[PDB]
Amino acid sequence: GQVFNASKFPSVYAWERLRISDCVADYSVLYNSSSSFSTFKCYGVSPTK
Amino acid sequence: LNDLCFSSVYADYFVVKGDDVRQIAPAQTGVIADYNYKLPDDFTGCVLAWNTNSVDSKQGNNFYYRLFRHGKIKPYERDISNVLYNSAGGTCSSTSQLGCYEPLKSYGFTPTVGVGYQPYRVVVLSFELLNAPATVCGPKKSTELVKNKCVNFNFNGLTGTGVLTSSTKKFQPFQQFGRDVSDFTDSVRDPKTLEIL
Amino acid sequence: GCGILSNKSKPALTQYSSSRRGFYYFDDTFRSSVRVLTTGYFLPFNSNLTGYSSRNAVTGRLIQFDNPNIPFKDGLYFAATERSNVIRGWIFGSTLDNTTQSAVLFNNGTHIVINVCNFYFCQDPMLTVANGSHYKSWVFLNATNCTYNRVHAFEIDPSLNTGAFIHLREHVFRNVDGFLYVYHNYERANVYDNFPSGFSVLKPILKLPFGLNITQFKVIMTLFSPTTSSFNADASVYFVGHLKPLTMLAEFDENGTITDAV
C-alpha cells in the first residue's frame, strides 16, 4: 500500500527506490486494495510462482 | 485454421473488463485467472476478444466477477454459488459481522468510463486433433482421387507426399488413419468414399 | 416427495481384495502389437476395497441402506454385484445441497438421465418399483439453475429372480479438465457376498463437459414393494476403491486390445 496507494509519485528522470524486507509477499491482497494492472510482466520468474 | 479439420470444438464465452483480458491465457495469475476462469498449461485453441462499450454499458447491465474465494479453481471449472465469505475461515451471516464480504463484485461498466474499465466480449475456442471423425472442417475444396502416381495429398488436413493405392487392411469403426512402428502413415480412410487406401 | 427410512442399520465396511481389476483405456491413440509403460491414476493391484450393502429389513434387523458420503479425491473405482438392478445411479458434487451445483446421473424406467443443477436432495435418495413396473423417483425435491441436461435411450427391466448375483458391473469415474469421464465393463459372475477375482479392462462410454467440482460421491438405490403401502430393500453389494498415481505396463495385441497389465 505504501507504494501502490501512495499520494505522490516521483518523475521518471528522478525515480525513487525502496527496500522491502522482513515481510510476506502476498500479491493476492492487490485484488481488493489496488487498481487493476494493465501491465504485469515478469522476466526473472513466472508470476504464478 | 482454414486448412485443418477438428474432431471436437468448444466455444467458451463471457464478459470481462479490458484490463482483465490479458488474464485469459495459460499460466496466468489474477482475480480472473484464479477465481473465475482458468485455462490449462497445455491449451490448444484460440482466444478472441473485442470492445463492446457501446452495447454492454447500458443502465440495465449486470456484470459480476468473483473477488473473494478460499483457494483456487481448476481449469474449465465453474462456481456460481453465492454465500458470504468469512475472511477468518468457515461461514458467516448478516454481512455486518466484521469479517463478512459479498463474494461477487460488480463491474462499474458505465459508458463514460476510461479505456481498461470498458467491457470486452471474450470467446475461447478449444480444439482437439485426434485420430477420430472430423466434426468441423475449414473451407477447402476437394479434388478427384488419383492412384498409382507420386502426388501430394491432404485428407482432413493430414498431408504428405507419396503413391496412393488400394488397401486390403481393415480399420476400426472410428479410425481415420493407421501408422507403423516408425510412426509412418501407411493407411488412410477416404472422407467421402468409405475405402481404405 | 422423499422416501423415509427412520431406522437404519450400520454399514459393515468389510474389506475386499481388488485382485487385478480396475484397469481402463487411458488413451485415445490407436496402438497394436506393442507394450507401453505409462503413468496416471489407476487402482493398485491387490488393493483394499470397502464394501457397502443393501439388506431386506426383518423383525430382528433394521433396514440396511448404505449411502454414506464418499470422498472422490483424484478418481473413484466403483463395482457392484446384483440380482435385480437395485443400483440405478450416482450423485457427484461437493456440498451435496442447494448451495452449489451437482450432477445427478441415473438410469430410470425408460431413459438414462444426466442433469447438472442446484438440487435440494432427499435425505435418502432412491427410486421405487411396484407390481413389476416402475413407480416413482425420489432423488430430489427442487432443482433450479440447470446448466446441463442430456437424456439417452435405454431400457431397464428389473425383477425378482430369487437367486444370487449373476452379473458384475464395473465403473471408473475421473474428473479432469472440466470433463467427467466414465469407463464401463460388464461380465457374468457367480457369487453371493464377495468380490470376483481376475483381470479386466474398462472402456470409455461418457465424456461429459460439466465444469463441475466433484469432491463427494453418493449412490442412488431402488426399493421394491407391490401395493406401495411401504417399501423394503433387496440384497445388493457395491464396492469402492480409490485411484492412485502409479506406473504401469500395458500390452496391446494385434487388434489394439489390452490383454495384460503390470
Ligand SMILES: *[C@@H]1O[C@H](CO)[C@@H](O[C@@H]2O[C@H](CO)[C@@H](O[C@@H]3O[C@H](CO[C@H]4O[C@H](CO)[C@@H](O)[C@H](O)[C@@H]4O)[C@@H](O)[C@H](O[C@H]4O[C@H](CO)[C@@H](O)[C@H](O)[C@@H]4O[C@H]4O[C@H](CO)[C@@H](O)[C@H](O)[C@@H]4O)[C@@H]3O)[C@H](O)[C@H]2NC(C)=O)[C@H](O)[C@H]1NC(C)=O
Ligand atoms: C469444491 O467445492 C468444495 C466445497 O465448497 C471446496 O471445499 C472448500 O475448500 C476451501 C479451501 O480449502 C475450504 O476453506 C478452508 O477450510 C479450512 C479447513 O476448515 C475445515 O476443515 C478442517 C479440517 O481440516 C476442520 O477442522 C474445520 O472445522 C472445517 O471443517 C479452514 O481452516 C480455512 O480457513 C483458514 O485458512 C484460510 C486460508 O485461505 C484463511 O484465509 C482463514 O483465515 C483461516 O486461517 C486461520 O486459521 C488457520 C488455522 O489452520 C491459521 O493457520 C491462519 O493463520 C489463520 O489464523 C478455510 O475455511 C472450505 O472449508 C472447503 N469447503 C468445505 C465444505 O469443506 C473445494 O475446494 C472446491 N474445489 C476447488 C478446486 O475449489
Ligand SMILES: *[C@@H]1O[C@H](CO)[C@@H](O[C@@H]2O[C@H](CO)[C@@H](O[C@@H]3O[C@H](CO)[C@@H](O)[C@H](O[C@H]4O[C@H](CO)[C@@H](O)[C@H](O)[C@@H]4O)[C@@H]3O)[C@H](O)[C@H]2NC(C)=O)[C@H](O)[C@H]1NC(C)=O
Ligand atoms: C438461480 O436462479 C435464482 C432464481 O430462481 C436466482 O435468484 C436471484 O438472484 C439475484 C442475485 O443476483 C437476486 O437479486 C438480489 O436481490 C436482493 C434484494 O433483496 C438484492 O439485495 C441483491 O443485491 C445484493 O447483493 C449484490 C451482490 O450480488 C450487491 O452488489 C448489492 O449491493 C446487494 O448487497 C440482489 O440484487 C434475485 O432476487 C434472486 N431471485 C429470486 C427469485 O430469488 C439466482 O441468482 C440464480 N443463480 C445464479 C448463479 O444465477
Ligand SMILES: *[C@@H]1O[C@H](CO)[C@@H](O[C@@H]2O[C@H](CO)[C@@H](O)[C@H](O)[C@H]2NC(C)=O)[C@H](O)[C@H]1NC(C)=O
Ligand atoms: C459424399 O458426397 C458425394 C457426392 O459428391 C457422394 O457421392 C455418391 O457416391 C455414391 C456411391 O457410393 C453414388 O451412387 C452417388 O451417385 C454419388 N452422389 C453423387 C451426387 O454423385 C458420397 O457418397 C458422399 N459420401 C458420404 C460418406 O456421405
Ligand SMILES: *[C@@H]1O[C@H](CO)[C@@H](O[C@@H]2O[C@H](CO)[C@@H](O)[C@H](O)[C@H]2NC(C)=O)[C@H](O)[C@H]1NC(C)=O
Ligand atoms: C488392507 O486391509 C488389511 C486389513 O484387513 C490391512 O492389514 C492390517 O495391516 C496393519 C498394518 O500392518 C496390521 O497392524 C493389521 O494387523 C493388519 N490386519 C490384518 C487382519 O492382517 C492391510 O495392511 C491393508 N493393505 C493396504 C495396502 O492398505
Ligand SMILES: *[C@@H]1O[C@H](CO)[C@@H](O[C@@H]2O[C@H](CO)[C@@H](O)[C@H](O)[C@H]2NC(C)=O)[C@H](O)[C@H]1NC(C)=O
Ligand atoms: C435449500 O435447502 C434448505 C435445507 O437445508 C432449505 O431450507 C429448509 O426449507 C424447508 C421448507 O421447504 C423447511 O422445512 C426447513 O426447516 C428449512 N431448513 C433450514 C435449515 O432452513 C432451503 O429452503 C433450500 N433453498 C432453496 C432455494 O431451495
Ligand SMILES: *[C@@H]1O[C@H](CO)[C@@H](O[C@@H]2O[C@H](CO)[C@@H](O)[C@H](O)[C@H]2NC(C)=O)[C@H](O)[C@H]1NC(C)=O
Ligand atoms: C424417465 O425420464 C424421462 C425424461 O424426463 C421421463 O419422460 C418425460 O416425461 C415428461 C412428463 O413428466 C414429458 O413431458 C417428457 O416429454 C418425457 N420425456 C421424453 C423424452 O419423452 C419418463 O417419464 C421417466 N420415467 C420414469 C419411470 O420416471
Ligand SMILES: *[C@@H]1O[C@H](CO)[C@@H](O)[C@H](O)[C@H]1NC(C)=O
Ligand atoms: C488509497 O487510494 C485511494 C485513491 O485512489 C484513496 O481514496 C484511499 O483513501 C487510499 N487508501 C488509504 C488507506 O489512504
Ligand SMILES: *[C@@H]1O[C@H](CO)[C@@H](O)[C@H](O)[C@H]1NC(C)=O
Ligand atoms: C476490501 O476493500 C475494502 C476497502 O474498500 C476494505 O475495507 C476491506 O477490508 C477489503 N476486504 C478484505 C477481505 O480485505
Ligand SMILES: *[C@@H]1O[C@H](CO)[C@@H](O)[C@H](O)[C@H]1NC(C)=O
Ligand atoms: C430407532 O431410532 C430411534 C431414534 O428415533 C432410536 O432411539 C432407536 O434406538 C432406534 N432403534 C434401534 C433398534 O436402534
Ligand SMILES: *[C@@H]1O[C@H](CO)[C@@H](O)[C@H](O)[C@H]1NC(C)=O
Ligand atoms: C400386477 O399385480 C396385479 C395384482 O395386484 C395384477 O392384476 C397385474 O396383472 C400385475 N401386473 C403384471 C404386469 O403382472
Ligand SMILES: *[C@@H]1O[C@H](CO)[C@@H](O)[C@H](O)[C@H]1NC(C)=O
Ligand atoms: C420446491 O419443492 C416444494 C415441495 O417440497 C414445493 O412446494 C415448491 O413449490 C417447490 N418450489 C418451486 C419453485 O416449485
Ligand SMILES: *[C@@H]1O[C@H](CO)[C@@H](O)[C@H](O)[C@H]1NC(C)=O
Ligand atoms: C482380431 O480380430 C479378428 C476378426 O476381424 C479375429 O479373427 C482375430 O482373432 C483377432 N485377434 C486377436 C488377437 O484376437
